[PDB]
Amino acid sequence: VRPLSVALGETARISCGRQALGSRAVQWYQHRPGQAPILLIYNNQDRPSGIPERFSGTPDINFGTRATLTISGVEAGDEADYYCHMWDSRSGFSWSFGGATRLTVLGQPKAAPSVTLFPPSSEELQANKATLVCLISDFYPGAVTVAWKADSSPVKAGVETTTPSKQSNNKYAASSYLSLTPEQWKSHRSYSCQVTHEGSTVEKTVAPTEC
Amino acid sequence: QVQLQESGPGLVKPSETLSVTCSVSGDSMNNYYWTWIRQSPGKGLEWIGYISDRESATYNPSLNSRVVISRDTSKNQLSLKLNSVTPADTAVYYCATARRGQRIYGVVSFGEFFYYYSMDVWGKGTTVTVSSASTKGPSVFPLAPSSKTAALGCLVKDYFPEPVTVSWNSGALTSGVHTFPAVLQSSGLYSLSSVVTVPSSSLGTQTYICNVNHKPSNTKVDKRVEPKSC
Numbered sequence: 102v103r104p105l106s107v108a109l110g111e112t113a114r115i116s117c118g119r120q121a122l123g124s125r126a127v128q129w130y131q132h133r134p135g136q137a138p139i140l141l142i143y144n145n146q147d148r149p150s151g152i153p154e155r156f157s158g159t160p161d162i163n164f165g166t167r168a169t170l171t172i173s174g175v176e177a178g179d180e181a182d183y184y185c186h187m188w189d190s191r192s193g194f195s196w197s198f199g200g201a202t203r204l205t206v207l208g209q210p211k212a213a214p215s216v217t218l219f220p221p222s223s224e225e226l227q228a229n230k231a232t233l234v235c236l237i238s239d240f241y242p243g244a245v246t247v248a249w250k251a252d253s254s255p256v257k258a259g260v261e262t263t264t265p266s267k268q269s270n271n272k273y274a275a276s277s278y279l280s281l282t283p284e285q286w287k288s289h290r291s292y293s294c295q296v297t298h299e300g301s302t303v304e305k306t307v308a309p310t311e312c
Numbered sequence: 313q314v315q316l317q318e319s320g321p322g323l324v325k326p327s328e329t330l331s332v333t334c335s336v337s338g339d340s341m342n343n344y345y346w347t348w349i350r351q352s353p354g355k356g357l358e359w360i361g362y363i364s365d366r367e368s369a370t371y372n373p374s375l376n377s378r379v380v381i382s383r384d385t386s387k388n389q390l391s392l393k394l395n396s397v398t399p400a401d402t403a404v405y406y407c408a409t410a411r412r413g414q415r416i417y418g419v420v421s422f423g424e425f426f427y428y429y430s431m432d433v434w435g436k437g438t439t440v441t442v443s444s445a446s447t448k449g450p451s452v453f454p455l456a457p458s459s460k461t462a463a464l465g466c467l468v469k470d471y472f473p474e475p476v477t478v479s480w481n482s483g484a485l486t487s488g489v490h491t492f493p494a495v496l497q498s499s500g501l502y503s504l505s506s507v508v509t510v511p512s513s514s515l516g517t518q519t520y521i522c523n524v525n526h527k528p529s530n531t532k533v534d535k536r537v538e539p540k541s542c
Binding site for chain 1: 349351356357358359372373374406411413415417424426428430431432434435436437451453454455456459463465467469490492493494495497498503504505507540541542
């Protein structure tokens with residue numbers, strides 16, 4: 102990928118990875134994680150219905166005009182991978198979609214994480230296992246620290262945590278799982294999931310002795 | 313209102329044949345050219361091939377003649393078969409319509425034109441993993457609501473391969489739903505959680521069921537989530 106970053110509201114200009122020799126026909130595709138790719142622009146400038154007119158391509162007008170995708174008033178929701186599928190009269194059949202330009206949109210408001218911590222279910226404990234589940238959502242930017250405590254002692258055993266990734270609302274989500282024996286679960290006064298984000302901390306606690 | 317939905321095996325062993333289907337709705341397959349594109353972990357989009365009207369298919373040489381694309385008009389289905397698979401064939405596979413354009417840059421009579429394709433309608437994709445490891449269906453546990461809105465959910469534990477889909481109340485409950493990205497454990501097994509924030513005063517009266525689907529293992533678990541016995 103070719104990373105590019107632009108501030109909210111600014112005009113992004115993404116250059117095609119390959120330049121045309123002769124007459125060209127260029128398609129642009131947007132690909133957001135968890136979604137099918139979407140056709141943004143075809144035949145150089147044509148815009149499918151449903152695509153915002155904030156998106157435009159370069160016309161082929163016999164200037165040495167580099168094919169470029171322009172996005173005016175860049176929004177958080179424009180953060181995606183962009184593909185320029187370049188066809189020209191000298192290059193032969195274009196099997197490659199080319200590399201992605203990964204557009205990161207910066208300048209968004211800090212948002213503190215929502216944190217939900219679930220203790221082990223009675224059903225899991227009956228099966229002789231125990232998992233604490235910490236779900237972290239709606240935060241921005243994406244850098245976060247997730248720590249677990251047993252009572253007040255830090256813990257590093259049984260801990261599996263995801264890399265944060267963008268949600269549909271363009272904030273981040275992550276989760277952390279702490280695997281315990283039922284005996285460990287019941288023998289402590291409490292366990293906490295502690296999430297530190299931009300210098301501040303959201304912390305949830307569960308206890309075997311409380312509902 | 314033409315719509316595309318892919319379906320596949322979820323897991324194939326190396327050296328076997330990967331077979332995916334795309335069901336077409338809202339129009340006749342006959343009114344479109346068809347294509348498959350895949351999206352591999354760590355790689356960009358890869359164009360597999362396309363098939364025109366007269367059942368004539370053209371394939372990306374990158375797949376080294378391992379690919380067959382075909383139509384079954386009696387089912388309005390598009391098919392892809394990829395043989396001799398390796399872990400490099402692990403990807404999300406998408407079906408799409410293709411629009412053929414013709415750019416003339418000189419006299420047509422002298423063949424001074426080229427055809428190009430725009431992919432205008434895409435399916436949602438279907439994940440296929442190529443591994444010698446055996447599939448494993450998840451164990452599903454309820455994540456009961458606080459006793460003190462409240463969040464409740466389902467823990468979808470220890471499965472392979474990706475993905476798992478979760479709905480709530482058989483699709484009827486969508487607002488406030490959040491299914492989180494799975495964690496990949498050291499064991500190479502996945503776990504995820506799905507949460508829904510619902511009104512606290514709905515608890516005990518309103519039924520909340522998380523529907524878990526892991527296609528590769530043919531696991532469908534319907535898990536009621538009720539308030540803590542305490």
